[PDB]
């Protein structure tokens, strides 16, 4: 339903190996991917042209054997499960890839902040600059920060517990399927963005 | 530059010694004195004055058993609206009145309710004319107005309200 | 800052506005008895290889 001029820049692509990223997908997924990144995928071997036989069934990369010996039949339940697994992996990758940015006020050049942060603020900035919606109950601070939350200025890190790990079976490729480490950098900013 | 010379010349008698004998030294002294007195009156006098009056009121309240903090908070609550100057005047010249104010603040007397928002009478929704009479809302407003008129002090208009409302009937000449 | 006599405001309370070890009570008090040659009045806990 895209416009023709916009669709001219995209091409239908079937994913062979699960790739994380704004232009990625799960193994056996059809998506409109941009020309440059789609050509990169097809040159690397992670993508295939969506023929009808391939839409029926596909071969995929096996992590254990390191070869494209995994034949897969594209079905509805398979698509649903793989989409959910891709969502879980994308959330993990987003929260484990880069820094989180906080900007607040602190009178003077002290080391502690004027107003300490909380799980609500952490989840707010997560949804803001990561586009990930989570509830504050999953955010568990460090042993020293269980009292007053994030208070130091500079660099800190918190734990975020992801419940859905063993149901989908991610414990192999992921470092730790139980929780993830969110690195948060807190700084002093101008008034309009500090707001406190 | 406008040096205040001809005005400050006449105040040299207040100074002493060389400032009073010579002219320029006395003029400099008077200029500095007036400038610093104006600065103090603008930015620092009110603080000291209000601190003094507050300390006096606090002492008068402590002689009864309370403090400036609780007294001020409860005055604001009861909505008495007495400035610290008046509180000091009462504490110094009307001890019985100040003690009665303290007793009012201490007692569990219900403070006045917030001012009621002006409401619209029910007759404003009545169709008029329903098919040379006055509007019902206007008549009720006039009645309340005449009531408020008679409520303020004694006057020869009388305490009744119907006879005072029906004054146009009296002024009307029978045709 | 100095806002009182040593009877009320100690000498180690001058840097109370600065953050760190000064906001605590010093361990050694050389202000009583004989005075030091270098005129040191307080010495905090020896943190590692540094002492204030």
């Amino acid at each position: 339903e895209m416009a023709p001029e916009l669709q001219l820049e995209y091409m239908p692509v079937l994913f062979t190996r699960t790739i994380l990223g704004p232009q990625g997908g799960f193994a056996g997924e059809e998506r409109l991917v941009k020309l440059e990144v789609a050509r990169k995928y097809m040159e690397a071997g992670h993508a295939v042209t969506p023929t009808e036989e391939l839409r029926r069934g596909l071969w995929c990369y096996n992590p254990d054997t390191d070869k494209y010996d995994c034949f897969i039949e594209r079905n509805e339940e398979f698509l649903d499960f793989a989409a959910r697994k891709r969502q879980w992996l994308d959330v993990y990758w987003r929260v484990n890839t880069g820094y989180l940015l906080f900007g607040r006020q602190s009178w003077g050049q002290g080391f502690l902040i004027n107003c300490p942060l909380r799980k609500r603020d952490v989840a707010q900035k997560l949804w803001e600059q990561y586009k990930v919606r989570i509830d504050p109950r999953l955010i568990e601070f460090r042993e020293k920060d269980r009292r007053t939350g994030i208070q130091e200025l500079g660099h800190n890190w918190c734990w975020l517990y992801l419940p859905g790990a063993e149901e989908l079976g991610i414990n192999r490729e992921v470092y730790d399927n139980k929780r993830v480490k969110v690195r948060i950098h807190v700084r002093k900013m101008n008034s309009m963005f500090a707001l406190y | 530059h406008y040096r205040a010379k001809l005005e400050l010349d006449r105040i040299r008698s207040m100074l002493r010694g060389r400032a009073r004998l010579e002219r320029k030294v006395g003029l400099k002294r008077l200029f500095f004195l007036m400038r610093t007195q104006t600065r103090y009156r603008v930015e620092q006098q009110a603080h000291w004055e209000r601190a003094i009056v507050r300390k006096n009121v606090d002492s008068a309240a402590r002689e009864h058993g309370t403090g400036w903090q609780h007294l001020r908070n409860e005055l604001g609550r009861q909505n008495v609206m007495l400035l610290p100057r008046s509180q000091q005047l009462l504490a110094q010249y009307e001890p019985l009145a100040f003690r009665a104010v303290v007793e009012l603040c201490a007692s569990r007397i219900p403070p006045p309710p917030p001012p009621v928002v002006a409401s619209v009478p029910e007759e404003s929704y009545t169709l008029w004319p329903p098919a040379s009479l006055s509007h019902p809302a206007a008549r009720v407003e006039l009645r309340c107005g005449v009531e408020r008129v008679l409520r303020r002090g004694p006057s020869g208009l009388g305490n009744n309200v119907n006879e005072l409302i029906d004054a146009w009937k009296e002024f009307d000449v029978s045709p | 800052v100095q806002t009182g006599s040593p009877t009320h405001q100690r000498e180690y309370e001058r840097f109370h506005h600065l953050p760190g070890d000064v906001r605590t009570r010093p361990q050694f008090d050389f202000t009583f008895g004989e005075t030091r040659a270098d005129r040191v009045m307080f010495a905090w806990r020896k943190r590692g290889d540094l002492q204030l």
Binding site: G108, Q109 | H47, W48, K55, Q69 | Q2, H17
Partner: peptide, 24 residues
């Protein structure tokens, strides 16, 4: 408040005004 490192130290006049009593 309490100035940090970069802010210069300024000595203000001691508050000599009369203070009320801190009742409990």
């Amino acid at each position: 408040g309490f100035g940090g490192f970069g802010m210069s130290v300024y000595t203000p006049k001691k508050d000599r005004r009369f203070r009320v009593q801190p009742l409990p």
